[PDB]
Structures are given as structure tokens and as C-alpha cells.
Enzyme design. Structure first.
Site, PDB file in Angstrom:
ATOM      1  N   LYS A 227       0.846  -1.181   0.000  1.00 19.26           N
ATOM      2  CA  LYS A 227       0.000   0.000   0.000  1.00 19.26           C
ATOM      3  C   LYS A 227       0.887   1.238   0.000  1.00 19.26           C
ATOM      4  CE  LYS A 227      -2.550  -0.772   3.587  1.00 19.26           C
ATOM      5  NZ  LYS A 227      -3.410  -1.548   4.524  1.00 19.26           N
ATOM      6  N   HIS A 228       0.270   2.393  -0.197  1.00 18.38           N
ATOM      7  CA  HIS A 228       1.008   3.642  -0.169  1.00 18.38           C
ATOM      8  C   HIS A 228       1.336   4.020   1.265  1.00 18.38           C
ATOM      9  CE1 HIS A 228       0.315   4.353  -4.435  1.00 18.38           C
ATOM     10  NE2 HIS A 228      -0.956   4.061  -4.243  1.00 18.38           N
TER      11      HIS A 228
END
Ligand SMILES: *[C@@H]1O[C@H](CO)[C@@H](O[C@@H]2O[C@H](CO)[C@@H](O)[C@H](O)[C@H]2NC(C)=O)[C@H](O)[C@H]1NC(C)=O
Ligand SMILES: *[C@@H]1O[C@H](CO)[C@@H](O[C@@H]2O[C@H](CO)[C@@H](O)[C@H](O)[C@H]2NC(C)=O)[C@H](O)[C@H]1NC(C)=O
Ligand SMILES: *[C@@H]1O[C@H](CO)[C@@H](O[C@@H]2O[C@H](CO)[C@@H](O)[C@H](O)[C@H]2NC(C)=O)[C@H](O)[C@H]1NC(C)=O
Ligand SMILES: *[C@@H]1O[C@H](CO)[C@@H](O[C@@H]2O[C@H](CO)[C@@H](O)[C@H](O)[C@H]2NC(C)=O)[C@H](O)[C@H]1NC(C)=O
Ligand code: CLR
Ligand code: CLR
Ligand code: R16
Ligand code: R16
Ligand code: NAG
Ligand code: NAG
Ligand code: C14
Ligand code: C14
Ligand code: C14
Ligand code: C14
Ligand code: C14
Ligand code: C14
Ligand code: C14
Ligand code: C14
Ligand code: C14
Ligand code: C14
Ligand code: C14
Ligand code: C14
Ligand code: C14
Ligand code: C14
Ligand code: C14
Ligand code: C14
Ligand code: D12
Ligand code: D12
Ligand code: D12
Ligand code: D12
Ligand code: OCT
Ligand code: OCT
Ligand code: OCT
Ligand code: OCT
Ligand code: OCT
Ligand code: OCT
Ligand code: OCT
Ligand code: OCT
Ligand code: OCT
Ligand code: OCT
Ligand code: OCT
Ligand code: OCT
Ligand code: OCT
Ligand code: OCT
Ligand code: OCT
Ligand code: OCT
Ligand code: OCT
Lengths: 527, 527
Positions: free
Chosen positions: B167-168
Site C-alpha cells: 500500500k502507499h
């Protein structure tokens, strides 16, 4: 007020001091529905102070109202009236005898005005372009007629302006939505014969072609189940909620059966009163009549448990509420037995007007027999076009004769009545009379389009053959991109026919433009 | 229990009779977050009957727990521990002084086991195929490297197994999700130069090419806004909720600016220590450094009302909760001033860890300057490949030198620290150090892929150049068909990393297969 689309307000004033009233509402469109409770109006407590209660009545069809004393259970007053959209009506139950008078407080709106104006706009554009232009292999009519059917399918799926005649009928009869799928099946049969004859004339083997037919059918079925049926806005796919029948699944089954039948009994086209195309394919006719006899026998003679034999009604409150869970008859029983209620269509069209609770699938197992019969009639049209391509008089004579024969059969079955025939017109059952009616319509359309578009060349098919050349991509496309702007934006008034109609017309014209663009780029997808 | 994904249970037992306790939780991943209340545990009423209360603690990063007496507001006990997924932990606040002991009632599960096993499966398949095969114009490495970036973009968008490193990042630092968009911009710059040079060498006019560049940019922007951004499952599009910035919008703006710059200052390729490709394009470098100075000035010197000047933090509870509505600094202020909070991204990645309330768009206006700088570095890579195509040693020397220079700049800016640099790595701000870091990574990847795939031919790029040849169709495709089976089905356990990982890997492999099928049919779409 708080009125929704296609409803009116009915204020009921009770001038009676001693007897309460209960109001029963029945639509005129029904065939043998039950009266349903509308509103209960209590007695007036004191003289000169009538009691009041309001209700919303549907304005799509005529209404039948019944006033019954709640204790006596006796009919004091009954009136049948056709309320108008967004009207404000008042009903007064006077005394001396008991009589009712219906007064129009506020006049209703004209709900069909946008449809009237839309046809004037389109007619004007046709005349303007025809006036403006005048001042300055493949049969085209088959692509034109396929494009017309597909364009109306796109318009109807989007909603059709939320108009009751651009929607499917509840159980029996025809609307404009009920015409466009049988026509597509008819044209698909014509294309099956034309394409197969060209392919086999080029010298292709029958086993390579059989593999192609099987591959196309499998692709159509899979695309329908996995892409077209599910509503993926609700959530991810689970098997217990998967609907197996559908439009593309039935196109796939019909395509397989009809194409394999023609391929198996294929003959070269020989090169004028004759029945050559009817007698050179007598095995196909024999199997088609046997299959039709199977449909008739399973429909009128199969014993369905807890249900009358040969029942063609909608259930729900229809037929006086005797048969509430018998929606479909043997067709629905076979669907439920072989697929289970959770793999069927949970929102049949009969739900709105007959209040049915059981799931029924219009594209079920039993009606595929009549889907196949419709496509085989389309094959007969293609045979007429090829066996007699040299002579236009022969083609036109045969189209006219077939239209008259099928129309006579349809008139005999339906008894030109919506609900009183021996086999009434019914999309959900895919009746025999539905097939013969829509086939005579398609033969007449071919009779008109063949000279105009093909023989004389007066009209070139524009803009209808552009989606007729990319039918499968257009049909899958508008299902994938139904909720996307510019096909659908947020409406200022969701209770407006004008705004829904404008949205649906704009979206349909956009799919015509998209198909034209694909034609200019030569991006033709053949499943 | 009722534990969700990536949480553990913490039972807190109070052995104290006189003082209540309040439990404060802070993640180790934060930079200067505030302590947030976890649970309130009342005092034990009678001796020998400790009070109990339960809580769920995040197990993705290490936790910091603080025990404070609610009345005295004094720290009785503090412990920092790394809880494991689905663990069952007990905390006892003993008496004699006050001390805490944390006991593991039930051991946690290994949450990274599916990721460990997935790499072993993929590594085994590589060895098996390499062993099995052994027993029995265009640069390929650019398509291979574009396909790798796109494949990881598809895997990350689907969710990346719900793993925090697929994920970011919340605000600062790098995960695997943060690598794949800058790499795509880099490769797009390389392709811009290569394609433009070939086109102009064939003799095409610069105005036809300028029209093509403008048309491609407009198409990318429109596709992003109308197709890729909106969630049409929620409802129809309304203007007040339309998000203007996005991934394809920023690809379009970057493509226009970089392509027009190269086209305007285009030169023919001349035919070995030299700086020919660096000096023959000094106007482009001059404009790029001026634009970068603009980004630095607007970021560190623009006065933002009600906010510190040159603020690069996340707001929310970050930086000790002083600056709650200052997410982004000048970048977010410019976005809000020019577009308004309702046309921005309503769910920034900082929301989960810093609890920010304001909308912030990672693809906003101010970071397009650094998007353009990244694509222009990609252009420099393409210039190296063409100016020195004859000599492999020259190409490799230049790739290595550029990687070292950019890596030294990135080390200077970041101070090899996640939050303590002068310009930390930050995807949301599209920092300068983010660009230099990801550019040195891309130069190193090219340094490895060019000999292997292009010079020696040891590897042919399979299966990564198949989506590298149809990047735009694959990217738009997985956005349209994200919720569709077989890309997404219903999960037996929605709190399982194994089931999400299997779903996302299967869907990504399916898009690789779809792109291979499009390559076999030669259906290449170039926007
Ligand atoms: C439907 O029409 C009746 C008229 O009979 C409206 O009744 C009026 O209601 C307002 C406020 O409720 C009163 O001030 C008027 O005196 C009423 N008029 C009469 C003649 O009684 C009723 O409001 C209308 N309903 C709508 C427009 O939704
Ligand atoms: C309203 O009252 C009328 C009575 O006039 C009902 O009509 C009768 O219904 C019974 C069934 O309960 C039948 O056996 C009779 O043949 C009907 N007609 C007459 C003249 O009695 C009517 O059913 C009532 N409405 C509703 C909805 O029940
Ligand atoms: C977490 O672990 C504790 C063990 O300390 C579990 O507590 C048990 O709870 C059951 C029912 O609530 C009791 O019958 C046992 O006596 C308890 N054990 C002890 C040692 O006190 C608790 O249920 C666990 N929570 C889970 C698994 O969700
Ligand atoms: C828990 O209690 C400790 C006291 O030991 C708090 O730490 C102090 O907080 C105040 C602010 O209210 C500061 O001025 C002090 O410098 C802090 N340290 C000390 C040694 O007093 C801590 O803030 C409390 N926890 C929370 C979440 O408020
Ligand atoms: C091939 C064409 C001509 C027709 C073939 C199908 C006919 C012969 C079959 C199909 C379903 C069959 C019916 C199914 C069930 C019942 C059971 C019993 O109550 C009497 C026979 C009866 C009513 C059958 C009569 C014959 C029937 C109607
Ligand atoms: C082209 C490259 C080299 C840089 C060009 C942009 C520079 C010169 C501009 C961009 C934004 C500008 C700032 C904007 C606002 C303020 C107002 C005031 O408080 C002092 C000047 C100051 C701080 C400006 C200084 C100059 C500045 C930083
Ligand atoms: C049933 C209502 C639907 C209305 C569909 C009308 C189609 C209008 C076509 C407009 C686009 C023409 C593009 C091709 C021009 C050569
Ligand atoms: C980051 C995890 C994603 C996994 C993607 C791996 C791709 C596997 C490819 C399988 C399909 C190959 C089709 C082409 C064969 C020539
Ligand atoms: C009419 O209905 C009311 C209840 O709303 C009831 O109290 C009354 O008794 C009814 N009328 C008669 C005559 O029973
Ligand atoms: C602890 O909290 C309770 C409320 O849950 C409160 O009644 C009690 O007074 C508190 N303890 C002290 C020492 O005040
Ligand atoms: C494309 C053009 C769509 C026009 C649809 C017709 C709307 C007419 C509105 C009439 C209001 C009374
Ligand atoms: C709603 C009931 C519809 C019944 C249709 C009956 C008419 C059959 C067609 C008549 C001849 C058609 C020639 C085009
Ligand atoms: C007015 C409510 C029903 C609408 C009628 C539709 C059925 C008849 C359509 C006729 C089409 C003729 C094509 C040859
Ligand atoms: C020479 C090429 C042969 C290609 C396959 C032909 C046979 C296909 C059989 C399909 C039958 C499907 C039954 C449901
Ligand atoms: C040469 C490719 C052959 C593929 C065949 C796949 C099976 C098709 C069967 C579809 C039958 C649907 C109607 C009964
Ligand atoms: C030129 C080769 C001719 C061979 C005959 C082919 C006939 C195909 C019949 C298909 C039957 C399929 C049943 C499912
Ligand atoms: C080659 C001549 C064969 C004649 C077979 C008998 C005619 C069969 C025609 C069936 C048509 C039924 C629907 C019109
Ligand atoms: C050209 C040769 C003759 C064309 C005849 C057209 C027949 C169309 C029938 C339409 C009936 C309303
Ligand atoms: C395509 C294959 C997908 C496999 C993904 C890896 C799943 C491993 C599960 C391990 C369970 C402990
Ligand atoms: C999370 C902080 C990341 C900082 C990265 C610093 C390293 C810069 C790259 C080093 C040389 C790269 C050669 C491939
Ligand atoms: C473990 C948590 C962060 C994940 C590290 C990702 C950043 C560094 C990736 C290195 C890629 C090198 C390519 C040349
Ligand atoms: C000879 C062909 C010319 C085609 C058009 C060339 C000019 C295009 C201008 C685009 C500018 C866009 C500004 C935002
Ligand atoms: C020949 C076709 C020309 C079409 C031009 C349409 C306008 C494009 C402008 C896009 C600019 C985006 C980056 C600023
Ligand atoms: C062969 C013709 C050469 C003419 C020069 C073309 C240069 C194009 C410059 C584009 C500038 C666009 C600004 C928006
Ligand atoms: C034809 C020679 C012109 C030389 C101009 C001066 C060199 C400019 C190079 C700028 C490079 C800056 C980044 C490496
Ligand atoms: C073939 C000519 C020489 C190839 C050299 C490859 C360089 C790759 C560098 C990788 C460093 C880990
Ligand atoms: C012939 C095509 C059949 C496809 C059936 C798909 C439905 C499976 C859903 C499984 C989700 C758990
Ligand atoms: C309020 C009306 C907004 C949308 C109007 C119709 C848009 C159709 C044309 C779009 C072309 C892409
Ligand atoms: C450059 C493309 C802009 C497209 C904007 C579409 C949003 C309009 C929505 C209108 C709905 C009322
Ligand atoms: C329970 C698992 C159902 C779906 C399994 C994966 C399907 C991927 C292959 C589908 C090919 C169209
Ligand atoms: C219902 C027909 C409408 C036709 C409008 C055509 C304008 C594109
Ligand atoms: C199975 C639904 C998605 C199909 C993807 C094909 C895209 C060209
Ligand atoms: C193509 C794979 C279908 C899987 C069906 C699973 C039914 C439980
Ligand atoms: C000469 C015309 C013959 C048409 C036969 C149609 C059979 C229904
Ligand atoms: C095979 C013909 C069956 C017809 C059913 C009619 C019975 C009333
Ligand atoms: C083809 C789906 C079959 C589902 C089983 C249902 C049996 C009643
Ligand atoms: C030119 C031949 C006309 C045939 C007409 C048949 C019935 C419309
Ligand atoms: C073929 C027309 C039949 C019409 C109905 C006859 C009575 C069952
Ligand atoms: C082969 C699956 C169909 C792809 C969807 C097409 C949407 C235009
Ligand atoms: C995370 C890499 C997984 C590779 C699996 C490949 C099997 C198609
Ligand atoms: C504007 C979103 C839908 C675009 C339709 C194009 C289908 C090929
Ligand atoms: C392409 C038409 C866009 C319409 C925008 C309307 C904004 C209120
Ligand atoms: C001889 C190699 C020169 C490389 C120059 C790189 C500039 C950053
Ligand atoms: C144009 C360079 C600006 C640098 C800003 C640094 C101020 C501390
Ligand atoms: C491009 C969209 C502009 C919206 C206006 C907002 C001004 C604060
Ligand atoms: C064969 C030339 C090798 C050049 C190496 C440069 C640094 C890896
Ligand atoms: C170009 C590297 C600069 C490193 C930071 C210097 C202090 C502002």
C-alpha cells in the site's frame, strides 16, 4: 406535492356520520386482479365537519375505485376513472342514498408531451437533412434492420423515459420493449444462413465451421453469465446468487442449435412459382415442428405440483388471487426444478402489477424452443433472399406470403385479444403467438426495407447499419458503461418524464455515434 | 475472536484499588503523532478482584502504550511492544511501586507467511521452466520495464494482499506501491523521445505531430476524469462531486509538456568521452531547472494562511497536533484555492495513521512540476540509448554515472532518514528526493535489463512486455473491470491475508494473460 412519477392525489371526504368507509383500488390493465386496500376513511364525528384522508393512485392506466362500509361489508359506491399525472382530485361521499362526485381541484399535466415533441424534433431533422442534401457481398437491409432493433434495445434498457410503453408488459400483450429481442433473433437466423452459405461456398470444411459455431456459442453464454447479468455495484460474485439464464445465454443456445442444424443439413443453392427453399430443407422443418409440439405439450399438459395444469397466468393477485405462487406455470416450474429460485430472475415484470413473490426468469429453459423457432423463421427469410436473388418480384411475393400466413396464425391464436386468446402474446413465456406475431412484423419490415435500401437504393440505411455492424460490441458496451457519464448524469428532477427521456435519448444517440466511429476505423468485432 | 485483520487483543487487568488508569496508544511508524486514548480501566473494587477491560491494538507497526492515572495525570507505567496479528495478550498492572508485565496468552499467527510462500512458488516456477526449456525497430527492455511497472500497478491497485507494504505510505518514506508510478513516468519520457525521433526521421511534419501530441493529451485527461476517477457504484455523476486531478490527467499534462518541449527543440541524432546528448539539449535543461526552482520556491517560501511557511508535514495528529488542517502545506493550499476541497481526493493516505480531516490530492497541481522532471530524466535515458546505440560500453557507462549522480543527490536531500531529511521522500508531495530516488532506481534497472534483454538476449522479456505493449488498455481495463469476476469473487474470510493475496495474484496474472492474448491478435491500442 410529495407525488412520485405517474401518480395523482385523491382526497376522500366523508360526509357520513354513522358508517366508516374503506377504499379499494384496482387497475384496468389487470386481468382478474383482486381489489387492494387504498385508504381507510373514518366517519365524520360531527355534522358539517367531514373527515378527510389522502391517497396516491397510479395514473398509467385507468383506475377502478370501490367504496365499502367497513362493518357492513356492503358496496355503497363504485366509480372508475382515469386519473392524470400530478393531479389533485377530491372525492366527496355525500348523503342523499349515498352518492360520490369526483372533482378536479388541479388539472393534471400532459405526461406524453416530451414524447410528442421528441417525434416532432426527429421528424423535422429528417425533413431538414433530406431537403438540405437534395438542394446540394453484404445485404444492406439486414444490417439496417439489425441496427434498428439494437438501437431500440439500448433505448429500452436505459429506461425508455420511464414510460410504461417503453417498458416490458407486466404479463400479457405487447409494448415497444417487447418487439426488439424477437426481431434480433429473427435477423440472427437470417445472418446464420447467409454467412454459412458464403463460407461453405468458399470451400471451407464443415468441421472447422462446427468448431467456430461451438466456440461462438460458448463465448456468448460465458459473456452473459459473467459480464452482463450480475450487478457488481452490490458486491463480489457468489455462486449462490448467480443468475444462469439471460439474453446472451439464450442467443448462444439458439445460435448453436440453429447453426448446427443448418450446417448438418446444408445444401448448395440452386439457380417463378416454386417451393424450392421450403422443400429442400424438409428435415429442418420436421425437427422444428417436433420441437414446437414438445413446447406445446410441456406447457399445456405437464402436471405442476400445487398448480393447475396448462396455467399461463401470472399468479400474484392475478386470476383473483387463487394461484399466488404459480407465476409461469410449467415454464417456471421447470426453471425452479432445474436451476432453483436463487439462480433465476428475482424481479419479474409481473411484480409491479400482479404483486408476485416468486422468482421467474423470462429467458428460462422452456422458451428457448420458441427462441429457436423464431431464429429458424429468420433462416427461412435468408433462404428466400438467396434462392431468388436475381428476381425482386419473387422475393417480395415470398415475404408478403409469409407475413400473411404468420399473421393469420397469430390472429387465430390470440383472438385479437390481450388476455382472452388460446395462447396470448406473452414475452415472459415466449409464447407461440408472440413468435408468430413478431415474425409477421419482421417479414413486413423486410418487405419494406429490401426495395428501399437494396433494390432502389433510395436510402442507404444511415445511421442504423453502423450499430448493425457492431451489434455485439454495442450490446456489451452499454451494459458495462450504463452508469457512466455521459450516458447517465444526476437529474435535477427524478420524477420528471422529460428529464429521463432526454437522458435516454442522448445516451442512445451517443451509442449510435460510437458505433459509427468504430465503423470508420473498421473495428468490427465478430464474436 | 472479533479481531479484524492486522489486530491483536490486549486485556488490561487493574490490580490497584485506589487509582484508575487510562491507556494511551501511539504507533512507532508515526513521526510526532499524539497519544490517543485506547481504553479506560476502572479501579479494582475489592482486593483480589482485579478489574478487566479489553482493546484492539494495530499490529502492522510497533506500538507504544502509556498508562496514566486519570485524576493525578501522572505516568505510572509505559511499555513499547510489537503485537502480532490475532494475538491474545494480557497486561497486568501490579502493585509493589507500580509495575507492568505483558504476557502472551495465545501466540500470534505469521501474517507474512503467504507472501513468503508466494515468492517460493514463483521462484520455483522460474527454475522449473528454465530447467524444462533448457532440457528441451523497438527496444525490448523498455517494453519489459514498462510491463513490470504496469503489472505491479495492477497488483497494488487491487489491494496488494491488504499488506501495509503493498500500500502507499501514510506520509513519508517508500513502500512497494510508491515505486511504480514514477517508473512509468520515467519510461514514458524515454518512449516520447524514441518515438518522436523515429517519426521525425521518417520525414513527418512538426505540426501534424504537434496535433497528435495535443490530441493524445486531451484524450488521456478526459478518460481519467470521466472513466477512471469516479465510483459509479455510488451514483450518477454530479459536477460538485467530480474529482479533477488524477493519474491519467497527470500523465496527460506531463506528456503534453515534455513532448512539446522535445518537439520544439528537436535535433537530428549525430553519429568515447563526450557530453553530446547533454549539451545538444541545453535549452530543455535550462527550462527544467527553472521549473524545479519554481517548485522549490512555491513549496518552501509561499505563505499559506493559518499555516507555517514551508510546511511538509501531514497535519492531523502529526507534528504533535499543532497543525491539524495543514495537510500538504503549499501544495494542498494551491489545490484548495484553485479547485476547492470537493474537487480533490477525499481519502488521502495520511488519514489512517495521522487522522487528517481535510481532502488532499496526491496528483495535485504543484507536483506536476516534479512529474515533468521525472519524465525529462526518462528522456535523457532515451537520448543515451540513441546517441550511443552502436556502443554498449558507452550506454552502460552513462546509465551507471546517472544512477550514481542521482543517488548522491537523493542521499544528500533525505539524509538517509525517513522523516529527518531536508526534503524527505514523499509520494503525496511528489518531492524532489522522491524523483531523484526513483530515477536512480530506474537507471539501475535499465543498466541491468539492457544487456540481459537487448545485448546478450539471454532473456526475452516474457511475460512482462505483453502488457508493456498495451499499457493504456490494461490500465483502463482493470479500472473498469475491478469488481468483476474472475478478478474478484466473494471471500470466505475477509480478515485473511492469504485469501486476499490469492485473489489479487490471480487477478494480476489474468491481466498478464489478457495482454498476451491481445499481443497474439496484434490488437495494440496507442492513445
Ligand atoms: C390539493 O388541492 C386542495 C384543494 O381542495 C388543497 O387544499 C388546500 O390546502 C391548503 C393547505 O393545506 C389550505 O390552505 C386550502 O384552504 C385548501 N384548499 C381547499 C379548497 O380546501 C391541497 O393542499 C392540495 N394538495 C396539494 C397541492 O398537494
Ligand atoms: C365490497 O363489498 C361488496 C358487496 O357489495 C363485495 O362484493 C361481494 O363480495 C363477496 C365476497 O366477500 C361475494 O361473495 C359477492 O358475490 C360480492 N358481490 C355482492 C353483490 O355481494 C366486495 O367483495 C367488497 N370488496 C372487497 C374488496 O372485498
Ligand atoms: C484471550 O485469552 C484469555 C486467557 O487469559 C481468555 O480468557 C478465558 O475466557 C474464558 C471465557 O471468557 C474463560 O472460561 C477462561 O477461564 C479464561 N481464561 C483465563 C486464563 O482467564 C479469553 O477468552 C481470550 N479471548 C479470546 C480468545 O478472544
Ligand atoms: C501522561 O502523564 C504524563 C505525566 O508523566 C504526561 O507527560 C507530561 O505532559 C505534560 C502536558 O500535559 C507536559 O507538560 C510534560 O512535559 C509531560 N511530561 C512530564 C514528565 O510531566 C503525558 O502527557 C500524559 N499523557 C497524555 C496522553 O496526556
Ligand atoms: C413431439 C411432439 C409432437 C409432442 C411430444 C411431447 C408429448 C407427446 C408429451 C410431452 C409431455 C407429455 C405429458 C407429460 C405428463 C403427463 C402425465 C399424465 O398426466 C398423462 C400424460 C401426460 C399429460 C403427458 C402426455 C404426453 C406429453 C404431452
Ligand atoms: C525560477 C526559479 C529559480 C525560482 C522562481 C520562483 C521564486 C523566485 C518565487 C516563487 C514564489 C516566491 C515567493 C512568494 C511569496 C513571498 C512573499 C513574501 O513573504 C516574500 C517573498 C516571497 C517569499 C516570494 C519569494 C520569491 C519566490 C520564492
Ligand atoms: C429511439 C430513440 C433513440 C434515438 C436514436 C437516434 C440516432 C441519431 C444518430 C445521431 C448520431 C449520428 C452519427 C452518424 C452520422 C453519419
Ligand atoms: C506481483 C504479483 C503479480 C504476479 C504476476 C505474474 C505473471 C504471471 C504470468 C502468467 C500468464 C502468462 C501468459 C503468457 C505466457 C506466454
Ligand atoms: C369507525 O372506525 C373507528 C376507528 O377509527 C371506530 O372507533 C368506529 O367504531 C367505527 N365506526 C363504527 C360505526 O363502528
Ligand atoms: C474511577 O472511575 C470511577 C468511574 O468509573 C469513579 O467513580 C471513581 O471515583 C474513579 N476513581 C477515583 C479515585 O476517583
Ligand atoms: C438529443 C435531443 C433530446 C431531446 C429529447 C426530447 C425532449 C423534449 C422536451 C419537451 C418538453 C415539454
Ligand atoms: C396486444 C395484442 C397484439 C395482437 C396482435 C395481432 C395482430 C397480428 C398481426 C396482423 C398482421 C401483421 C402484418 C404486418
Ligand atoms: C400503445 C400501447 C402499446 C404499444 C403498441 C406496440 C405494439 C405494436 C407495434 C407495431 C409495430 C409495427 C412494425 C411493423
Ligand atoms: C479440424 C478442426 C476441428 C475443430 C473442432 C471440431 C469439433 C468441435 C466439436 C464441438 C461440439 C460441442 C458440443 C457441445
Ligand atoms: C475449436 C473450439 C471448440 C470449443 C468448444 C467449447 C464448447 C462449446 C459448447 C457450447 C454449447 C452451447 C449450446 C448447447
Ligand atoms: C466436409 C465435411 C463434412 C462432414 C459432415 C459434418 C457434419 C457436422 C454435424 C455436426 C453435429 C454436431 C452435434 C453436436
Ligand atoms: C425434394 C422434395 C421433398 C419434399 C418433401 C415434402 C415437403 C415438406 C415441406 C414441409 C414444409 C412445412 C412448413 C411450410
Ligand atoms: C422496386 C420494385 C417494387 C417495389 C414495391 C415496394 C413494396 C413495399 C410495400 C409497402 C406497403 C405499405
Ligand atoms: C496463482 C497462484 C496464487 C498463489 C498465491 C500464494 C498463496 C499461498 C498460501 C500460503 C498459505 C500459508
Ligand atoms: C525510506 C527512505 C528511502 C531513502 C532512499 C535512499 C537511497 C538512495 C539510493 C541509493 C543508490 C541507488 C542505486 C540503485
Ligand atoms: C520493508 C518496508 C519498505 C519496503 C521497501 C521498498 C523500498 C525499496 C525498494 C527497492 C527496489 C530496488 C529496485 C532497483
Ligand atoms: C497540418 C495539421 C495541423 C494539426 C493541428 C496543429 C495545431 C494543434 C495545436 C494544439 C495546441 C493545444 C494548446 C492547448
Ligand atoms: C488535431 C487535433 C487537435 C485537438 C486538440 C485538443 C486540445 C488539446 C489540449 C490538451 C492540453 C493538455 C495539457 C496542458
Ligand atoms: C517542419 C515544421 C517546423 C515548424 C516548427 C514547429 C514547432 C512546434 C512548437 C509547438 C509550440 C506549441 C505551444 C503550445
Ligand atoms: C553546443 C554546446 C552548448 C553548451 C551549452 C552549455 C552546457 C549546458 C549543459 C547543461 C547541463 C545541466 C545538467 C547536467
Ligand atoms: C554484455 C556486456 C557487459 C555486461 C555488463 C552487465 C552489467 C550489469 C550490472 C549489474 C550489477 C549488479
Ligand atoms: C459457463 C460459465 C460459468 C461461470 C460461473 C461463474 C460463477 C462462479 C462464482 C464463484 C464465486 C465464489
Ligand atoms: C446537465 C447536462 C450535462 C451533460 C449533458 C450531455 C452530455 C453529452 C455529451 C458528452 C460528450 C462526451
Ligand atoms: C475535460 C473533461 C471534463 C468532463 C467533466 C464532466 C463532469 C460533468 C458532470 C455533469 C453532471 C451534471
Ligand atoms: C472459489 C474460487 C472461484 C474462482 C477461482 C479463480 C477463477 C480464475 C479463472 C477464471 C477464468 C475465466
Ligand atoms: C424519439 C426520436 C428522437 C429523435 C431525435 C434525433 C436527434 C439526434
Ligand atoms: C470477465 C469480465 C472482464 C473481461 C475483461 C476483458 C477486457 C478486454
Ligand atoms: C471458472 C471457475 C469457476 C469456479 C466455480 C466455483 C463454484 C463454487
Ligand atoms: C408463390 C409463393 C409461395 C409462398 C409460400 C409461402 C408458404 C407459407
Ligand atoms: C401436442 C399438442 C398438444 C395440445 C394441447 C391442448 C390440450 C387442450
Ligand atoms: C446449473 C446449476 C445447477 C444448480 C443445482 C440446482 C438443483 C435444484
Ligand atoms: C415489382 C413486383 C411487385 C410485387 C408486389 C408483391 C406484393 C407487394
Ligand atoms: C393453427 C391455428 C389454431 C387456432 C386455435 C384452434 C383451437 C385450439
Ligand atoms: C471478452 C469480454 C468482453 C469485454 C468487454 C467489452 C466492453 C466494451
Ligand atoms: C508474488 C509472486 C507470485 C508469482 C506466482 C506466479 C504463478 C502464476
Ligand atoms: C465515457 C465512458 C464510456 C466510453 C464508451 C466507449 C466504449 C468503447
Ligand atoms: C461535456 C459536457 C459537460 C457538461 C458540464 C456541466 C457542468 C454543470
Ligand atoms: C563519460 C561519462 C559521462 C557521464 C556524465 C553524467 C552526468 C551526470
Ligand atoms: C529557489 C531556492 C529556494 C530554496 C528555499 C530554501 C529556504 C530555506
Ligand atoms: C476547474 C474547476 C474550477 C472550480 C472552481 C473552484 C474555485 C475555488
Ligand atoms: C563491457 C563494458 C562494461 C562497462 C561497465 C560499466 C559499469 C558497470
Ligand atoms: C544538492 C544537494 C543539497 C543538499 C542539501 C543542502 C542544504 C540545503
Amino acid at each position: 406535492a410529495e407525488l412520485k412519477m405517474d401518480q395523482a392525489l385523491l382526497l376522500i371526504h366523508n360526509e357520513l356520520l354513522w358508517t366508516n368507509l374503506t377504499v379499494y383500488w384496482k387497475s384496468e390493465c389487470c386481468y382478474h386482479c383482486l381489489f387492494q386496500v387504498l385508504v381507510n376513511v373514518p366517519q365524520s364525528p360531527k355534522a358539517g365537519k367531514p373527515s378527510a384522508a389522502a391517497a396516491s393512485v397510479s395514473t398509467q392506466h385507468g383506475s377502478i375505485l370501490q367504496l365499502n362500509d367497513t362493518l357492513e361489508e356492503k358496496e355503497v359506491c363504485r366509480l372508475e376513472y382515469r386519473f392524470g399525472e400530478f393531479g389533485n382530485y377530491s372525492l366527496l361521499v355525500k348523503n342523499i342514498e349515498i352518492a360520490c362526485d369526483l372533482a378536479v381541484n388541479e388539472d393534471p399535466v400532459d405526461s406524453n408531451l416530451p414524447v410528442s415533441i421528441a417525434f416532432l424534433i426527429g421528424l423535422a431533422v429528417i425533413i431538414v437533412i433530406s431537403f438540405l442534401r437534395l438542394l446540394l457481398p453484404r445485404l444492406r437491409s439486414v444490417d439496417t434492420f439489425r441496427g434498428i432493433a439494437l438501437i431500440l434495445m439500448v433505448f429500452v434498457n436505459y429506461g425508455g423515459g420511464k414510460y410504461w410503453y417503453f417498458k416490458h408488459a407486466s404479463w400479457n400483450g405487447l409494448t415497444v420493449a417487447d418487439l426488439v429481442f424477437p426481431w434480433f433473433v429473427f435477423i440472427m437466423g437470417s445472418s446464420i444462413f447467409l454467412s454459412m452459405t458464403s463460407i461453405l461456398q468458399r470451400g471451407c470444411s464443415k468441421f472447422r465451421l462446427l468448431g467456430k459455431i461451438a466456440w461462438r456459442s460458448f463465448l456468448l453464454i460465458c459473456i452473459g453469465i459473467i459480464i452482463v447479468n450480475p450487478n457488481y455495484c452490490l458486491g463480489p460474485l457468489s455462486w449462490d446468487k448467480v443468475r444462469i439464464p439471460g439474453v446472451l445465454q439464450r442467443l448462444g443456445v439458439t445460435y448453436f442449435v440453429v447453426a448446427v442444424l443448418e450446417l448438418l443439413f446444408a445444401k448448395p443453392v440452386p439457380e417463378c412459382l416454386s417451393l424450392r427453399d421450403i422443400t429442400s430443407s424438409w428435415p429442418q422443418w420436421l425437427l422444428i415442428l417436433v420441437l414446437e409440439g414438445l413446447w406445446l405439450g410441456l406447457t399445456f399438459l405437464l402436471p405442476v405440483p400445487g398448480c393447475p395444469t396448462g396455467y399461463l397466468g401470472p399468479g400474484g393477485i392475478g386470476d383473483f388471487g387463487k394461484y399466488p405462487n404459480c407465476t409461469g406455470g410449467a415454464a417456471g416450474y421447470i426453471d425452479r426444478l432445474l436451476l432453483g429460485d436463487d439462480h433465476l430472475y428475482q424481479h419479474p415484470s409481473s411484480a409491479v402489477l400482479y404483486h408476485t413473490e416468486v422468482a421467474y426468469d423470462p429467458e428460462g429453459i422452456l422458451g428457448t424452443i420458441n427462441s429457436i423457432v423464431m431464429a429458424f423463421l429468420g433462416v427461412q427469410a435468408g433462404k428466400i433472399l438467396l434462392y431468388y436473388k436475381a428476381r425482386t418480384k419473387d422475393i417480395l411475393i415470398r415475404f408478403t406470403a409469409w407475413c400473411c400466413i404468420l399473421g393469420l396464425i397469430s390472429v387465430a391464436l390470440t383472438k385479437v385479444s390481450e388476455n382472452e386468446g388460446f395462447i396470448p402474446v406473452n414475452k415472459n413465456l415466449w409464447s407461440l403467438s408472440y413468435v408468430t406475431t413478431l415474425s409477421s412484423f419482421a417479414f413486413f419490415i423486410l418487405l419494406v426495407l429490401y426495395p428501399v435500401v437494396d433494390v432502389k437504393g433510395l436510402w442507404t440505411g444511415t445511421p442504423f447499419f453502423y450499430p448493425g455492424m457492431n451489434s455485439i460490441l454495442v450490446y456489451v458496451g452499454h451494459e458495462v458503461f450504463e452508469n457512466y457519464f455521459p450516458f447517465q448524469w444526476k437529474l435535477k428532477d427524478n420524477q420528471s418524464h422529460k428529464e429521463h427521456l432526454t437522458q435516454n435519448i442522448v445516451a442512445t444517440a451517443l451509442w449510435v455515434l460510437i458505433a459509427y466511429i468504430l465503423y470508420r476505423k473498421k473495428i468490427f468485432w465478430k464474436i
